[PDB]
Every structure is written in C-alpha cells, then in structure tokens.
C-alpha cells in the first residue's frame, strides 16, 4: 500500500518533518554497503551503520526531550492560569467568556501538540525496530541486543502521554463548566464496498476508534444508529430540506444500539441563512421511550418531560428553559403539521477521532438502509406507534418487502475538519479525500435520499445524485451534462449567490440607467426645445430611451427575484447590447434623414 | 483445614513422601502453644533454625521424589519412542504393549500432577504463614523458589510434557494400525489466548509494539439523558459458594467450569449499567478449540438482591414485559428468558453469592470488524474481599449483594478496608486473542511471536484475574481455599529482563523453545476578506448612486435655467420640477440604503443585501416623465399629430 | 442537468458554480464603450439640430465616430462573449481599436476647430 | 509591484473626477449662457465641483503614498461620499429655491 | 496567459477615456454655441481634454508594453493627475475672470 518513508512523510506537519528517523537513508546505506562488498558484512560496515543509527537516535531523543519539556511547561502554566481564572470568579471583575474561551483554545492546542508528539515518538520507535530487523535479517550479524540497550539508554518512547491528555481534558472540562453562564469543513464521500477495508486501514494508522462498550468490545448492535424521520402526507418538510429554505426543519427520533434502548433523542435541524452564509442548527433532547408516543400526541406535557431535570437541580436554568422551549416548539409543529413517520435510516457508524482533539474526525457509516414507515399507500406499517416494530437492527432486514426498503449500495465517509487559521489539514487527510477510494458527494442526505427512493411516486423533485445511482464509482489507482431528470421529476439544486453579486446586479442597473438618462436627456431636449423637424429625430431617441429603460427594469427585477428563491440566473446579456446598438444607430439615422430630407425635398 | 484434605487424598504407596504439613504447622504454632503464660521471645533463633531445617528436609524429600519419578517416566517414554524409527521395527510394534505402557504412563503422570499440586499448595501455605507470623526473621520463600528452579520442568499451569509425549505416542500408535482402537483414557474456528505479566517500566514500550499493528480503542460514553471521566474503572464482583467449587473447578481445568460475575464501570452511586455474566470455556477431546460461551443479563440494582438471594423470578417477568413493550422481537425475548432461567438455576443449585471484587482499567487494541487479533491490557488491578463466610462478623450483609462500606459518598471509601481485606496486583495483565478460523498456520502474525518471546513480557499460562484474586485474598486461610495456582511463586521476584540479555539469557529460553518446536515439527514430519470586499462594494455602489444623482441634477438645472427659452415653458417647468424631485429622492435614498447596508455588513445578519424598491421607482418615474413629455409635446399644448399625421413635408 | 458537471478525475456529476465576474467584465467594458457612443451621438445630434451651418456639417464628424465606436463595442462584446462561453481569453485585440477611435475623435475635434476659426 | 491596486486608486480618482466634470460642466454652462440669477448658481455649482476635485486629488495622493509604503487599507474612506451627498443636496436645494424666488 | 493586469490597465484607460470624452464633448458644445469668451474657454477645456487623451493613450500603450516585458507599468502618476487638476482649475478660473471682466 505504502512504504514506511512515505508514511513518515505523510504523518508530519512540517514541525516534526526534519526530526523523523531517516528510515530511507538508513535503508539505502545498508543496501548500498551490502552491494558494494558482494553481499557481505564486516566489522567496519557494522561500526559505520551503528554510527548512523546512533546519530539518528540522538537527534530523535533530543527533539523528543525538548518537546516534552516544552509541553510540560505549557501544561503547568495553563493549569496555573486556569486555577487563577476560576479564583477570579469571586472577584469584582469576572474573567468572562473571552478569557474562558482563550483558555479552552490554549488547552486544545496543548492536546494537539501532545497527540502529535506521542505519534511522532511511536513512529520513530517503529522505524528503529524496522531498521534493526532488516539489519539482522539481511546480514549475518545480530544488532538487536546492543541497539535495544541503546534505545533503553535513550528512551524517547517510554513517555506516558495519556496522563497529559487526561489532565488537559480535565482542565478543558473545568474551564467549560466555570465559563458557562478556526474554519470547520465537513464533507461526505461515497465508498465502494471493495474499497472499504483499505480505506478503513488508512484511517486506523492516524486515528483511534471510539467504542460504545464498557468492556471495549465490538458487539454487533453497539454501532447501530437508527433514526425515524417525520413528514406530512404532502412531504412539506422533504421539499423544505431539498429546497434549502429559511427555517427548513427536519424532525427525527433517533436512538443508538439495539431496540432495547429506552432513550430516544428527539432532534430538530433548522436551516438558517444570511448573506454571510448558510448554517444548520441542531437541537435535540432525550426522552424516555415509554412516553414518546404520548409526547407525539400532546398527552405528555413539556413540563412532564423536564420535571425530574428541574427536581434534581443539576442543570442550569438557562439550559432547562432552552430545552423546554425546544420541546414546546417540536410538539407544536408535530401537532400542527400532522407529522407522521416516513423513513427509517439505519446504519452502523464507526467513529475515528483522537481524544480531546477535534482537528480531524471521521465517521464511516456502513450497511445503510432506509425503510418505509409511512402509510401513504394505505398500508399501516406503524400500528399506532412512532416506529416500525416489525424490524429492529437486524440488518439486512430479510423480512421486509422489496418496495419498503432501499439498501444503499455504498458506505458514507463523513470527514469533519476543524483547522485553525494559519495551518492546513494534515497530508494524510488530503490524500485520503482525493484518492481513488472515495467519491465526493457533497450535501448527501439520508433523509432526502430515503424519501426520494422510497416515495418516488409521490415526489416531483429529486436530488442530483438520484439518477446517478447506477454509475460505477470505482476508479483505477493513482465533464458530464448527460444527467437528465426522469420524466416528471425535476432535479432540484438550490443556487447560492455570492454577496458581492448583490451589488453587481445593482451596478449594471445604474450603468444602464445613467445611459438611459442621457438618451432621455436628448429626447426631452429635442421635444421641449427642438424645432418641429427635430421632433422627428426625437421620435427615434424617445423609442430608444424607453426600450433601454424597460429592458433594464425587467432584467434587473428578474435578476433580483431569481437571486432570491435560489434560482439559476443567466448572467449573460445577449439582447441588451445588440438592441441598444441597433436602436441608437437607427435613431441617429432617422434624425439625419429627417434633416437631409428637409434640406433636399 | 487442608490437613484433612491431605490425609484423605493420601495415595498409600507414596504416603511417606507427602509434606508433613501438620508438623510444620505445629512448629509454627509452638510459639503460641508453648509458654502460653510467658510471651517473651517465644520465637528464638533456635526455633527459626529448626524450622528452616525442617523445611529443607521436606523440600528435599518431596522434590527428590518428584524429579525421580519424572525422570523414570521419561525413561519409560524414551523406551517407548525407541520404536518410533526403523520402519521394519515400527511394523513389528505390538499394539497391546504400547497401549498398556501409555496407560500406565498417563496414570502415573496424573498421579504426579496431583502430588505436585497438593504438595506445592502446602509448601506455599506454610511459607506464607511463616512469613506472616514472623516478619522480624528472614523469609523462607527463597528456599522454596530455589528448589522450584531446581526442576527440569517449569510449573506454570501448562500441561506437563508428559501428556504432550503421551498424546504424540497415542497418535503414532493410531497412525500405525488403529485396528483395536485404544483405551478411553487417551487424550488428544479455533482460537488461542496468551496471557502475560508486564512490568510497569515496560508498559509504554509494549503498547508501542502493539500500536504499530492494531489501533487503540477509545471508550466513548453512549449518549443519554444528559446528552441534550476519561477512562472508567471496570469493577467485577465474582460469585462463589462456601466450598469454593467454581474456583477449584476452574483451577483444575475441568471442561465447562463457569465463572459468574457482576460487571459495571464507575461508581454505583451514578447508577451505571450492571451486567450479570456467566462465562464458560469448553474443551472437548474430539474438538480442537476452546469455545467460549458468555451469557449476560442487564440487571437493575433494585432487583439484584431478590434475584440472587431470595430466588425471586420477578425481575425476569419485569424485564421481559418492559422489552416487549419496547417492541423487542419474540425470539430475543425467548433467548432472554432462557438465559434468566439458566443463570437463576445455576445460582440456586450451586448456592452462589458475591465473593470478591476486582477493579481495574482496561485498554483494548483491535481492528474494527476484524476479529483476527485482539490485545487487552488490565492495569491498576485491586482485589477487595466481599465474602460473607465469617459468620460472626460478615464482611458484607448476607442479604445484600455488595459492600456498603466502599460504596458511600465519602470520597476515600478505601480507608474502610483493613489488613487482609484487599490486595493490589503489581503487574499489568495482557491477554492476546488470536481467532484462527482457518485450519492453516499463523498468517503473518510474527509481531505476536516477537512480543511473546520478548524481554518485555512474562507469559503466565492459564492465568485468570478471578483465580489470582482468590489466591491472594483467601489462599492463606485453610478453612476456605485448599488449592493454589502454580504462578504464585512468581509475583515476589522481579519479572524484568535485561535488554542486552534478551539475546544472551532470554534468547537462552527463546532458542531452547525454538529448538524444541522445530524438533517437534521435524519428528512429526518424520512420523474577514468577504466582509472587506462587500464593504468596498457598498462604497462603490453608493458612489454610482451619487453619479446618477449628479446626472439627474445636471439635467434638472439645465432645463430649469432655460425654461424661458424653451418652446413650451409650462412643460419645461413641469419637467424641471419632476427631475428636481427625482434628484432629491435619488440622493436621500442612496444615503439611506448606504446606511442600511453598512449596518447589515457590520451587524453581519440579514438574508439579502438588495433594495429594488428605489431602482424600480426611479426607473418607472423616468419612463412616466419621458412619456408625459412626449405626449405634451405632441398633444393639446403642442397639437400637431393626433394619430399618424406628420409626414415628410415639414 | 441544472449545472451538473463532472470533475476531470471523478465519476459523480456534482453541481458546479458559475462565476458571474466573467460576464460582468464584458458588460462593464461594453457599457463604458456605450457611454462613449451615447455622449458622442448626443453631441452630434445636438449640433445637427441646433447648430449653424458649420455646426451642422461638423455634426457628422462626431456622428461617424459614434457609429464606429458603437460597431466596435458590439463586435468586441459579442466576440468576447463567444470566447468566454467556450474557453475565454482574447485580450490582444483592443490595441489598434481604441487608438484608431481616439485618432478619429481627435481629428474630428481639430476639424471642428478649423471650420469654427476659419469661418 | 502590484499594478492592480494602483489602477484601482486611479479609477477611484477618475470616479470622483466624474462628479467634478458633471458639476463643473453645469456650472460653466450656466456661467457662459445664464442670466444674472443663474450666474450665481453657476458659482455655487463650480464651487462644489472645485471642492470635489480638490478632495479627489488629496485623497488620491494620500492613498498613493499609503499603497506605496504599506499596502491596502481602504477602510477609512467613509466621510467623503457622505459630505458629497450632503453638499449635492444642499446645493441643489439652494439653487432651486434661489431661481424660484427671483 | 494572465490578462488580469491587462484587463485592469484597459479599465483604467477606459476610465481616463470617459473623463476625456466628457470634457471634449462639453468643450465642443461650448465652441459651437458660445461667444468669444465662451470660445476661448472652450479652447482651453478642449486643450485639457485632448492633452489628457493623448497622455492616457500613450500611458496605456506604455503600460501594456511594460506589463508584457516585466508585468508592471510606469507609476509616475503622482504628476499626471496633479497637472490635469491644475489645468482644469486654471481653465475654470480663467473663464470666470473673463466673464467678470466683460
Ligand atoms: C448625451 C449628451 C446629452 C446629455 C448630456 C447631459 C445629460 C443631461 C441632459 C441635459 C439636457 C439639457 C436640456 C437642454 C438644456 C438647455 C438647452 C437650450 O437651452 O436650448 C435652447 C437653444 C434653442 O435653440 P434654437 O434657437 O435653434 O430654437 C429655435 C426655437 N426658437 C425659434 C423659438 C428660438 O438650443 C441651443 O442653443 C442648444 C441646445 C442643445 C445644446 C447643444 C448640445 C451640446 C452637447 C453638450 C451640452 C450638453 C447639455 C445639453 C444636452 C443637449 C443634448 C442634445
Ligand atoms: C471642472 C470641470 C470644468 C468644466 C467642464 C467643461 C465645461 C464646458 C461647459 C459645457 C457647456 C455646454 C453648453 C451647451 C450649449 C448651451 C445651450 C445654449 O445654447 O444656451 C441656452 C441658454 C441660453 O441661451 P442664449 O444663448 O440665447 O442666452 C443668451 C445670453 N447670453 C447672451 C449671455 C448668451 O443657456 C442655458 O441656460 C443653458 C443652461 C446651461 C447648460 C449646461 C449644460 C451642461 C451639461 C453637462 C453634462 C455633461 C454630461 C455628459 C455630456 C457629454 C458631452 C455631450
Ligand atoms: O518497505 P519497508 O517499509 O522497508 O518494509 C517492508 C515490509 O513491510 P511493509 O510492506 O509494510 O512496507 C517488511 O517490513 P517488516 O514487517 O519486517 O517490518 C519487510 O519484510 P520482512 O517482514 O520479510 O522483513 C521488508 O520486506 P523484505 O525484507 O522482504 O524485502 C520491507 O520491504 P523492503 O526491504 O523491500 O523495503
Ligand atoms: O456536523 P453537523 O453540524 O451536526 O451537521 C450534520 C452532520 O453532517 P454535516 O456536518 O456534513 O452537515 C450529520 O452527520 P452526523 O452528525 O450524524 O455524524 C448529518 O447526518 P446526515 O448525513 O444523515 O445528513 C446531518 O445531521 P443529522 O444526522 O442530525 O441529520 C448534518 O446536518 P445537515 O443536514 O445540514 O447536513
Ligand atoms: O426505582 P428507581 O431505582 O428509583 O428507578 C426508577 C425507574 O427507572 P427505570 O425505568 O430506568 O428503571 C422508574 O421506572 P420503573 O422501572 O420503576 O417503572 C422511573 O420512573 P419514570 O421513568 O416513569 O419516571 C424513574 O422514576 P421513579 O423514581 O418515579 O420510579 C426511576 O427513578 P430514579 O430517577 O431514581 O432512577
């Protein structure tokens, strides 16, 4: 797949690049020395290679010690600063959210440095072991004992960095609790099953695995995530999410694990938008399964949902009121719009992320199926229940009818990057997302895909990826406008407009308007001051001015209306220039012709 | 008291050579019995010297017998193997003679194994007792350990080479003819488990060698009601009865011996999930694996007492009804009911009750979706005595399933423990599981082979947390435990090894075992920017609005100052008025929308940065003004053309 | 396909972003040349409809320049639009155009000066 | 070093010179073709145009020095358009009422 | 080919050409309709317009050639705009002085 030197070159951030082991250099030296001596090894070659190894080991040990001391100093200083900040809360000037967020940012930087340093030390130890194994395998001399003693005498790897991560996470939690009153980029990719394992292995060389099990076992049902989505009979919310509207809501009841889980998360996603950009606000609260049905009927009052949360008192009142307002809004929307379960989105998610480090997070969702929950065809799939009890998490649901289930053929890779300004995403991520193992499909939605595939007969507007599900996305290791919407179901792609266009659309308007004024300035001048023969040319200039004004008004009213509603705007003007040129030239001809005919006729 | 067990388990022909454990117990207790009314230097140097002499005689006799019969049966096996060559002699092998020899050899090997087991238990007990009652005098563990080192077979709970040779020779005899079969006493997706003790100083290195191949698993808490400790402490409360039947059966390698425990994480005050787990390892002669079966039930702390003490089948019905209301399928409920009945009957028949608690931290390495290799390291292992065997002063209430002493809100409950109620395990425990589903050899797992033979670990075959806990907490008491694990005389020594000696003295064992394995194989084969840009755009748009305003003003004042010279002064004055109002509106609207958009850019909120009302009204007003001017210039005020009148005639 | 294009090395056709700046540059260039044309044509028609004999004769000297720059603006705008619709580019075609138009405008101005001062 | 910013500065100067040319053209036309009352409207308009051109020249020179030395920084250009809008409105109103009065 | 610098240079030349054409048109309007003083002022304004026209054209060609050679053009424009503003001011004041005198 890749050689170790490439792995070292790929795992650096230009700060540990120079100080990595020169694995390629040692390998080349060993191979060349073996070749030059006719495959043989002697004591002088052994001493030379040992000198090279000792120089590399001293460099690595020195850099590791320097970084270890620096990280300890930073941890001590930030711990003292956090303690002082906590103490200052009793003073007459609280440190406030700015100071607390500065502390949080510094703690995040320390976590990143600790993780990078631990990875660097581990990779260097791996390289040393590989070099020693290659040596005592290729030649007839054994170097494992002596170099093991040297490595023990310079132990850049015997450093427990887990304690540092625990301490910095504790400091971060304390800062977040006591303070409570970068650029983020998330992308979605399709992974063919044949390319799954390899892909997974790559992510396993850079990030650990989150296990939702107390015994750290990989049980079948632990990774299962299920989510029921809610819609009207008219699929109002599906169109609202497809056409990215302001206030577009997505209501779901999700849960984790098998169907013995008694905590169902009521979630709402709201699409907010300003000229700055589009954002999604997610708000969810946990509700005991037993009451979920009643909560959907209005029989379970919001105060009953958060009665014990207030009774315990281990929750700030601001959070309690926020959750109460969220629950009230969700229940009111469900009762008003008459929402019903439509699609269940089941999948198994494997999450890779370093503890306390949010720079790179990866979620691989496999076995993604979407089951039909609604009764729009007259078949009662959910017998007065918020979910279908005919199926659980028993993939691939062999008991379902073929019409009710859409088994998504690929897996979904969700890459979330949180990169502070001034740096860039790590190299391994960059070559992971641009390799042949993934197929970038931005804005893929499991709810939209499920509704479009299962309720296709009731849908007259489909996402862009739907008519492309038969495309083979496998690519060899290293322009298409024929994607036509099916008959009667137009592909919907909302078009977002750059803020500067909002002024450019105005700019040209004024640039036209002024010109029309000039033409009007002529047309009036030849009417109120012009002689009766000048009114003849004023006729043409008047026609030209009116045409220019009307064209300008209609063009830019249409442009404003189409920049709203997120419609595609044709920015090429193929009528205005030619029309104004012809009209102006003909007006000048008409004026000159009138004067000349007055002269000669 | 293990003296009665020694007497009852006396093999008469060897009756002389058993440890006289009662006699050593009497020399130890003579300091209390003798001079019962004078506690002044009861244990003098002469008493210590006599005790060491007696221990020396007992060690010499017992282990001389053990080595003598070990070598004698080895000679018998050599005489049986001398026929494993010279194919002509192989064809002449008498099956009955070989069968009888193998039968006698395996019976003798089993007898020697029992001999060593009880005698080792007795010697360990007496050594620990002497160490405990006499701390001011030197430890007698050294002599026992030295005599253990003077043994041609390392006692580490693995099957002795006797049985390996017996199985080989049975296979050879069956390969020869297998016509009269053999006796029933012949003993032969597979997986294999390795267990190591790792010193703390080596931990950080060892994990590295694991993290090269396997990713580390990070415990992520399942989202719960609060989702609108970095790494927990796993606690396992192991059950057992009064006679310690489960411990004895698991220590004696009886196939199907189960272990029952209650497992959770964190503190019980949090109300964590509690799992009652029955774990069983089965190893049948006809099989070639160690099939593992685990039956777990998620219990509730309210129902545990009645479930495990009163034999109340109410929690079963409660959980089944709850899960059925949650929609759980009928087959899952049937399996759950079967598990409930099985565990309840097991507890009731075996009369089990919580015995000891073990708390540790678990780190796991495994590739997701790949069961081929798993590594598990348990650190910070601590055992707490939770038994109710002391009738006068029970450690925990016999009607309660856990100790209330160490489960309170006091933030150091561990002070409640007294001497003998707790024990800390000094080394980390590593378990490597290899699921060899295929029947072939090991598919490129040489790093496990490196770790196992490395200086960084100490392999302890058949190790178990439960067995070690029982040995450390209840082993010193003869009233409860009468058998001890063979790995006990290894915790006291330093398991660390010299890295240079890894290929000077650790390669001694490494290459000895390597020569053993290759010779075995051989013989078997023989067998921001956006904000700034938009701000500038707003500036320029205001500039262009001012330009349009200036143009309209120029037109306005040009016609206003010449209205008198116009052919139609009334129309010119009306045009000047209209254009003056247009200029005023253009200026005021330009400034107003400039301010509004500036507020929107600095206050970065707002759906759109457009304002079509002003442009539209300006343009329509210009159109209306031009049309009105044309009409007045060609109607009543300037009547020359009602319809189409003007022609090319002036 | 509502603006669905496939990137060179991938298999799924994704929505593509069109850049209106390219069209806006063409519009602005044409509008600048149209300001030239409108102002010169207004001067010409004003001279023709309100000037004396000399002014009436000299009105053509600016009308012709206005027509030349209008034709040049339309032709250049359409050619640039055709270029951007396929590949773009084409900057090395507006050197002799502006120079010739400035030369003709200066010649017309000097000719107007000559008929004004001489007569 | 950066032609684009220099060209933008010159384009801004010429954009202000557009206002100067329009207002000064109206003023000069009134001066050479107007009556007595129009000839002071001419003076007011040409004063506004003169101020606009002088402000444009000073701002152009200052911005040229700034771009030559440091680079960028157009965030301080807010007062000029505001004063120009105010002066345009007040001059237009004053001239209109002065012509209407007489 | 990167004609961004060329396009910016063309935009600057077109702004200069807007200014010069507006000045020339207003001067020609002053010529054919004004009196002797009006004609003198028209001559001055047309001189300014045509001088700035030639300046802008020559500078545009030179800047394009230098961009082709190096990528940047002459930037001695701390004088050009200054002289243009100066001559505009002198022309307006001369017209006003002639009008006041007569
Ligand atoms: C595109 C360029 C034109 C627009 C640029 C300015 C934009 C704003 C538009 C302003 C329009 C001005 C309205 C008329 C101003 C007063 C004219 C007047 O008093 O005429 C009386 C006199 C009357 O002429 P007359 O004596 O032949 O009238 C005969 C009628 N009896 C017999 C009763 C007298 O007209 C003129 O002398 C000149 C009028 C036209 C001015 C010449 C245009 C030159 C272009 C540069 C000047 C720009 C301002 C004028 C624009 C006119 C465009 C054709
Ligand atoms: C800093 C900038 C400096 C100034 C820039 C250059 C200014 C040049 C001055 C231009 C004057 C244009 C005069 C047009 C002809 C006058 C009409 C006339 O005959 O007078 C009628 C009437 C009177 O006619 P009269 O001739 O019978 O009056 C008799 C009185 N005596 C004897 C004194 C002459 O005059 C007016 O009231 C006209 C009002 C003034 C018109 C000013 C128009 C300015 C328009 C500028 C807009 C520019 C937009 C783009 C234009 C591009 C070029 C086309
Ligand atoms: O290319 P390298 O990074 O130097 O490592 C590879 C290979 O590992 P990878 O395939 O993961 O790169 C093996 O490295 P180790 O497992 O020993 O650490 C090793 O093969 P062996 O196990 O047989 O030693 C050896 O391959 P070989 O020695 O057979 O040539 C070597 O490949 P190169 O030596 O060609 O670089
Ligand atoms: O990270 P978030 O701000 O919470 O946005 C989430 C996130 O996806 P994106 O980051 O790409 O937008 C979800 O993925 P997970 O949180 O489950 O890992 C995704 O899920 P889907 O792929 O099913 O759409 C959907 O959030 P949710 O799962 O709650 O529906 C999405 O919000 P968007 O709809 O805006 O993409
Ligand atoms: O008996 P407890 O130890 O106090 O636990 C109960 C139990 O919770 P669980 O369902 O999760 O086991 C109740 O449900 P039941 O099984 O007894 O029916 C539940 O009741 P509600 O969810 O309906 O409110 C809740 O509250 P309650 O104390 O009223 O029984 C809870 O109590 P805790 O908050 O103390 O855990």
Author numbering:
A (entry chain D): 1 to 181, 195 to 491, 602 to 724
B (entry chain E): 31 to 218, 232 to 271, 320 to 618, 722 to 844
C (entry chain A): 38 to 156
D (entry chain B), E (entry chain C): 55 to 156
Task: Pull text from the paper.
A 3D reconstructed density map of this InsP6-activated VTC complex was refined at an overall resolution of 3.0 Å. The VTC complex structure assembles into a pentamer with Vtc1, Vtc3 and Vtc4 in a stoichiometry ratio of 3:1:1. Our cryo-EM structure reveals that the TM region contains fifteen trans-membrane helices, wherein the TM domain of each subunit comprises three trans-membrane helices. The exit tunnel of the catalytic TTMVtc4 domain is positioned at the entrance of the trans-membrane channel. TTMVtc4 and TMVtc4 are connected by a well-defined loop (residues 472–618, named TTMVtc4-TMVtc4 connection hereafter), and this loop interacts with the N-terminus of one Vtc1 protomer (Vtc1A, including residues 1–21) at the membrane-proximal region. In the structure of our InsP6-activated VTC complex, a molecule of InsP6 (InsP6A) is bound to SPXVtc4 receptor. No InsP6 density is observed in SPXVtc3, possibly because the PBC (Y22, K26, K130) and KSC (K126, K129, K133) surfaces are partially buried and thus inaccessible for InsP6/PP-InsP binding. A second InsP6B molecule binds simultaneously to TTMVtc3 and TTMVtc4, likely promoting the association of the two tunnel domains. A third InsP6C appears in the positively charged tunnel domain of TTMVtc4, in a binding site that is normally occupied by the ATP substrate. Our complex structure reveals that the interior wall of the upper translocation channel is positively charged by a series of basic residues in TM1s, including K24 and R31 of TM1Vtc1, K694, K698, R705, and R709 of TM1Vtc3, and K622 and R629 of TM1Vtc4.
The vacuolar transporter chaperone (VTC) complex integrates cytosolic polyP synthesis from ATP and polyP membrane translocation into the vacuolar lumen. The vacuolar transporter chaperone (VTC) complex is the only known polyP polymerase in eukaryotic cells. Subunit Vtc1 harbors a trans-membrane (TM) domain, Vtc4, Vtc3, and Vtc2 contain additional cytoplasmic SPX (SYG1/Pho81/XPR1) and TTM (triphosphate tunnel metalloenzyme) domains.
